Amino acid sequence: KVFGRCELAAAMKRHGLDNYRGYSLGNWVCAAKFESNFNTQATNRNTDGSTDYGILQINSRWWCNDGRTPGSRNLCNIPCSALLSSDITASVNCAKKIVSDGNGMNAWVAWRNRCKGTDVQAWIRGCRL
Ligand SMILES: [Cl-]
Ligand SMILES: [Cl-]
Ligand SMILES: [Cl-]
Ligand SMILES: [Cl-]
Ligand SMILES: [Cl-]
Ligand SMILES: [Cl-]
Numbered sequence: 754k755v756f757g758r759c760e761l762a763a764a765m766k767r768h769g770l771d772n773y774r775g776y777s778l779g780n781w782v783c784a785a786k787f788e789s790n791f792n793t794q795a796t797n798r799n800t801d802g803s804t805d806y807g808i809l810q811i812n813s814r815w816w817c818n819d820g821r822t823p824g825s826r827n828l829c830n831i832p833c834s835a836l837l838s839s840d841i842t843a844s845v846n847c848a849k850k851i852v853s854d855g856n857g858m859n860a861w862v863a864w865r866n867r868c869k870g871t872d873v874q875a876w877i878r879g880c881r882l
């Protein structure tokens with residue numbers, strides 16, 4: 754599914770991610786925008802052979818099982834396919850684990866490079882939330 758901007762904000766707030774670990778909803782929408790362009794079925798292979806899945810490009814090296822990433826872990830205890838659903842519940846609950854791991858949203862390199870410090874409230878501007 755390709756969500757609209759405000760449609761994803763709303764879905765993220767429905768699933769408890771607005772201000773989760775102090776990160777306002779705009780930070781989540783901005784990370785989603787640059788990780789997947791709001792597309793739940795986005796997949797991208799990494800140099801190391803892991804793959805990133807879904808709207809927040811959650812990596813198989815640590816978080817999900819895809820059966821083809823050697824030596825990896827599955828700390829969200831889910832198949833990576835679950836992260837490609839039109840229903841973002843499995844992406845949101847795994848993203849809550851990821852942002853709690855120590856380095857906040859910096860786990861998402863694209864949020865550090867493209868969202869951190871900017872006016873992320875622009876991403877929820879005008880949305881009925
Ligand atoms: Cl947009
Ligand atoms: Cl915000
Ligand atoms: Cl694997
Ligand atoms: Cl393969
Ligand atoms: Cl594991
Ligand atoms: Cl699995």
Ligand SMILES: [Cl-]
Nearest residue numbers: 764839840841
């Ligand atoms: Cl949803």
Ligand SMILES: [Cl-]
Nearest residue numbers: 774856857858
């Ligand atoms: Cl933090």
Ligand code: NA
Nearest residue numbers: 813817825826
């Ligand atoms: Na894995």
